[PDB]
Amino acid sequence: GFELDKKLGRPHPFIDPTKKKQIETTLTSDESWWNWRKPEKEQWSRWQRRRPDVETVFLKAMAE
Amino acid sequence: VDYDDGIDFPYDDPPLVCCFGAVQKEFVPVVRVHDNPMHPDIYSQWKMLQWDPPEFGRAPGGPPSNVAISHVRLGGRAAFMGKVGGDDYGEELVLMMNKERVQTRGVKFDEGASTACTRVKIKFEDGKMKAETVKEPPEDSLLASELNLAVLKEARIFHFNSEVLTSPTMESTLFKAIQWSKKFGGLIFFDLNLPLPLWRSRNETRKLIKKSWDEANIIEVSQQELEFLLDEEYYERRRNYTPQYFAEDFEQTKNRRDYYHYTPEEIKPLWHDDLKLLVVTDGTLRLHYYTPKFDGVVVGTEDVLITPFTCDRTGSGDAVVAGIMRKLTTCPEMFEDQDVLERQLRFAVAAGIISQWTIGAVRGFPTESATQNLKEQVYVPSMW
Amino acid sequence: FVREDYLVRKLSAQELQDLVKGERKVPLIVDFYATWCGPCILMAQELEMLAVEYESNAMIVKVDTDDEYEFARDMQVRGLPTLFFISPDPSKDAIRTEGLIPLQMMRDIIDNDM
Amino acid sequence: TEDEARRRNWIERGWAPWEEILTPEADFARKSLNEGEEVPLQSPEAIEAFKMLRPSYRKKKIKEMGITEDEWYAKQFEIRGDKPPPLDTS
Amino acid sequence: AEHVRAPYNGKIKFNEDLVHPTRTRHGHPAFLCYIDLSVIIES
């Protein structure tokens, strides 16, 4: 499976799922300074949508 | 009444919707008195009333053919039921609806009538000019025997305005169409859009619309129509109240615009058993929704000042209604899930916003992908 | 010295009363409009062109519904824009049209029915 | 001098040193900015104010004092400074 | 000046008792490092 797909260049996850771990627990906004707290409400951005491009469209067509 | 009509068929998706009434080009029905008129001749000044409109004209509705055209552009399928004359203007109206891919098998031709032409007689009663109708136009003369029952069998939503209540012929025909649609399981959509005569008095209008109000499963009204039907002066007094010494809360100090959400107990005189969804529109700014189980408001917005020379609010009320109908047919959980209903109604808000960016209602009706794009640009991703 | 820019006259209900009661020889076309109604901008330009086409063979007037709301309702105005085509023959009945009708359709009504 | 001007402000302009109930961020800003711009905080007040920037540290501090959270919330709305001589109505 | 950026997503790990509290010129709390501190990111 993995490590044979990786050796040959066949499609495979960049990180082996078996050798993948969570990131434990991080600060929950009560152990954090004010400047590192997540806003309570999501903020409008104008960058909140992914930019369309040719690569996204071709990759989806090749995936199908 | 008796039996069915047509051959039963698998009925392609998306589900069909039927729009009933008069097909007209433009023709804003809701007319009241505004206190800020522009120059009577220089119509280049009149666009300033498009970006500071009268409240009743913030998102005007129109003829039912506007909703059908707008619904199709948003990705739905629609059929128009009505009558036009056999003259050249009648063909132009039908060719307009065929170009927009609206089904016109429900449209009947009257070869002896002139389209959009009413014969009236002028009288001089009590020293004042009045007119009375001698012969109604073909638009208001569809008969019950002329109904296309294949459309009424297939259609899942039956849509009509209160303009048909101003015609004795159409009113009788309307209630036969509703009977057929209900027998076939269709939902009844009453989009009020009160014409000029029905603004005269609350009591006469409430009696006139009561029968059609009781037959409707979905009702859309404007904030001005709802307040007029309940009590116009109480809500105007409520808006004009200012505390004498201090505000009751911090938000009252900001002197913001009033977006009052009517309680379901205030709405109770207008509620009935078969009503599934009541929507009260404050333009595109607010969409108050009411169901038997819950109620709430969807916050919207408007920007006509982004394009001061092409902005035109006419037809934006029809785009909002068409957007509601587009989502109701494809997302039936809207009736029972509040979070789903609010997300789907934001699609209708976006359609209304785009519709205000073009001169002419039909010319400016938006497509589905444009509406979906604007919705995702305006709202944060968690609200999509 | 300077020609006026607009041909269509705005009339009061009282002024329109005397014009209809009085003797007329040309067809009378009455336009109901409001400056806040978007389609009235398009109709205003069509009626100005109709006035140029029919110099003295027709009389084109307009009435503001903001000023004559009660008069408009009694005339069976159901919405805007609305046109009334009134014949010089007192026996013939007037024609009421609704919506942004084409200029050619106005000409056919005036020539064949007025 | 800075004795007549203070008295003048009280009598003529109605000045009074009214209590300012500050958030931890505002309390830290006034205690730390007195030291410099980008310097190691040295004063015990600014060091403590830095620690109080986390509400988790405050809860641990409150528990070590044996009081409840609401009592701590009420102690910050306390009149500072000296008290007037108590009334003796005859 | 030079900015150190995180090379991976993950959780920052260091001993806050080895560094000195400070306020930055942007008004933020931070730490001043006067030693060769070892900071760990678990990706």
Q: Are strands B16-20 and B77-85 parallel, antiparallel or unpaired?
A: parallel
Structure tokens belonging to residue B303: 């920007």
Beta bridge partners of C17: none
Q: How far is A11 from chain E (nearest CA, A)?
A: 23
Token pair 């809500």 is found at B235
d(CA B372, CA D82) in angstroms, rounded, equals: 65
C-alpha torsion sign, points B192, B196, B197, B199: positive
Token pair 């934001």 is found at B346
Q: Which of D45, A29, D49, D25 minimizes the C-alpha distance to E27?
A: D25
Q: In what order do the strands lie in the sheet with B286-290?
A: B107-110, B77-85, B16-20, B157-161, B187-191, B218-222, B277-282, B286-290, B295-299
Structure tokens belonging to residue D52: 């109080």
- Assign D30 to helix, strand or coil: helix
- Assign B370 to helix, strand or coil: helix
Q: How far is D82 from chain E (nearest CA, A)?
A: 32
Long-range own/partner contacts, residues B223-227 (CB < 8 A, 24 or more apart):
B223/B55, B223/B280, B223/B281, B223/B282, B223/B286, B224/B32, B224/B55, B224/B56, B225/B30, B225/B192, B225/B194, B226/B262, B226/B267, B226/B270, B226/B280
Contact C101 B25 (CB under 8 A): yes
Rounded to a whole number, what is the distance in angstroms from the first to the last CA of chain D? 39
CA-to-CA separations, B105 to B94, B98, B101, B113, B152, in angstroms, rounded: 10, 10, 12, 19, 11
Q: Are C38 and B314 in contact (CB under 8 A)?
A: yes
Q: Are C95 and C113 in contact (CB under 8 A)?
A: yes
Backbone angles phi, psi at B314, to 5 degrees: -60, 130
Total Cβ atoms within 10 A of residue B286: 19
| DSSP string over B163-207 | GGGG-HHHHHHHHHHHHHHHHTTPEEEEE----GGGGS-HHHHHH
3-state secondary structure labels for all residues of chain E: CCCCCCCCCCEEECCHHHCEEEECCCCCEEEECCCCCCCEEEC
Q: Are B1 and B140 in contact (CB under 8 A)?
A: no
d(CA B315, CA B365) in angstroms, rounded, equals: 8
Q: How far is CA D89 from the centre of its chain?
A: 33
Total Cβ atoms within 10 A of residue B296: 15
Beta bridge partners of B299: B286
d(CA B341, CA B349) in angstroms, rounded, equals: 12
d(CA B117, CA A5) in angstroms, rounded, equals: 76
Structure tokens belonging to residue D79: 């009149």
- The residue of C29, C32, C45, C78 whose CB has the most chain B CBs within 10 angstroms, and thus the best one to mutate to test that interface, is C78
Amino acid residing at D66: G
Does residue D37 sit at the E interface (CB-CB below 8 Å)?
yes
Structure tokens belonging to residue A25: 């627990």
Q: Give residue numbers after which chain B breaks (C–N above 2.5 Å).
A: none
Q: How far is E39 from chain D (nearest CA, A)?
A: 20
d(CA B183, CA B154) in angstroms, rounded, equals: 11
Q: Which of B14, B340, B10 minimizes the C-alpha distance to B156?
A: B14
CA-to-CA separations, D41 to A32, B59, D30, D34, in angstroms, rounded: 19, 60, 12, 10
Answer left, alpha or beta for residue C5, where phi above 0 means left and psi between -120 and 50 means alpha.
alpha
Structure tokens belonging to residue D36: 């410099």
Q: Are B338 and B313 in contact (CB under 8 A)?
A: no
- Assign C92 to helix, strand or coil: coil
CA B322-B325-B328 angle, 5° bins:
155
Catalytic residue among C8, C19, C34, C37: C37
d(CA B215, CA B339) in angstroms, rounded, equals: 27
Does residue E27 sit at the D interface (CB-CB below 8 Å)?
yes
Active site residue C74: no
d(CA C98, CA B115) in angstroms, rounded, equals: 10
Those residues with Cβ within 8 angstroms of residue B38's Cβ, 6 or more apart along the chain or in another chain:
B45, B46, B48, B49, C35, C36
CA C88-C94-C100 angle, 5° bins:
115
Backbone angles phi, psi at C102, to 5 degrees: -70, 155
E strand or H helix at B297 = strand B295-299
d(CA B63, CA B24) in angstroms, rounded, equals: 6
Those residues with Cβ within 8 angstroms of residue D70's Cβ, 6 or more apart along the chain or in another chain:
none
Contact E22 D47 (CB under 8 A): no
Contact E23 D40 (CB under 8 A): no
d(CA B245, CA B283) in angstroms, rounded, equals: 33
Backbone angles phi, psi at B281, to 5 degrees: -105, 125
Q: Are C71 and B22 in contact (CB under 8 A)?
A: no
Token pair 């014009």 is found at C19
Q: Give residue numbers after which chain D breaks (C–N above 2.5 Å).
A: none
Q: How far is B313 from chain C (nearest CA, A)?
A: 7
Active site residue C103: no
Structure tokens belonging to residue B361: 């209602």
- Assign B293 to helix, strand or coil: coil
Amino acid residing at C22: G
Q: How far is CA B282 from the centre of its chain?
A: 13
Q: Which of B358, B354, B383 minimizes the C-alpha distance to B369?
A: B354
Token pair 């015609």 is found at B167
- Assign A39 to helix, strand or coil: coil
Does residue A51 sit at the B interface (CB-CB below 8 Å)?
no
Q: Which of B49, B23, B51, B15 minimizes the C-alpha distance to B35?
A: B49
Q: Which of C104, C87, C68 minimizes the C-alpha distance to C96?
A: C87
Of E11, E28, E29, the CB nearest to A23: E11
Q: Are strands B187-191 and C28-33 parallel, antiparallel or unpaired?
A: unpaired
Alpha helices in chain B (DSSP H): 48-51, 64-73, 88-99, 149-154, 168-183, 202-215, 223-230, 232-239, 316-330, 338-355, 361-364, 368-378
Q: Closest chain A residue to E10 measured between Cα atoms? A: A23
Amino acid residing at A34: W
Token pair 């209604």 is found at B321
Q: How far is CA E22 from the centre of its chain?
A: 12
Total Cβ atoms within 10 A of residue B8: 8
Q: Which of B32, B80, B26 minimizes the C-alpha distance to B56?
A: B32
| CB within 8 Å of chain A, chain E residues 19-38 | 28-29
Long-range own/partner contacts, residues D37-46 (CB < 8 A, 24 or more apart):
D37/E23, D37/E25, D38/E22, D38/E23, D38/E24, D38/E25, D38/E32, D39/E22, D39/E32, D40/E20, D40/E21, D40/E22, D40/E32, D41/E20, D41/E21, D41/E22, D41/E23
**Length in residues, chain D:** 90
Token pair 């901008």 is found at C41
Q: To one decimal place, what's the resolution in Å?
A: 2.5
d(CA C48, CA B174) in angstroms, rounded, equals: 39
Q: Are B118 and C97 in contact (CB under 8 A)?
A: yes
Contact A34 D55 (CB under 8 A): no
Amino acid residing at E26: H
Residue B250 carries which DSSP code? G
Catalytic residue among C11, C16, C40, C114: C40
d(CA B324, CA B371) in angstroms, rounded, equals: 12
Long-range own/partner contacts, residues B368-376 (CB < 8 A, 24 or more apart):
B368/B73, B368/B74, B368/B75, B368/B326, B371/B74, B371/B323, B371/B347, B372/B347, B374/B350, B375/B346, B375/B347, B375/B349, B375/B350, B376/A48, B376/A49
Structure tokens belonging to residue B353: 């916003």
Q: Which of C84, C62, C85, C88 minimizes the C-alpha distance to C75?
A: C84
Rounded to a whole number, what is the distance in angstroms from the first to the last CA of chain B? 44
Those residues with Cβ within 8 angstroms of residue B299's Cβ, 6 or more apart along the chain or in another chain:
B285, B286
**Length in residues, chain C:** 114
Q: Are B212 and B167 in contact (CB under 8 A)?
A: no
SS3 content of chain D, % helix, strand, coil (to 5): 50, 0, 50
- Assign B41 to helix, strand or coil: coil
- Assign B82 to helix, strand or coil: strand
Token pair 């069909």 is found at B16
Structure tokens belonging to residue B307: 């394009």
Residue C31 carries which DSSP code? E
Of D29, D41, D53, the CB nearest to E22: D41
CA-to-CA separations, B175 to B1, B24, B144, B157, C44, in angstroms, rounded: 11, 22, 9, 15, 38
d(CA B192, CA B212) in angstroms, rounded, equals: 10
Token pair 């707008």 is found at B70
Q: Give residue numbers after which chain E breaks (C–N above 2.5 Å).
A: none
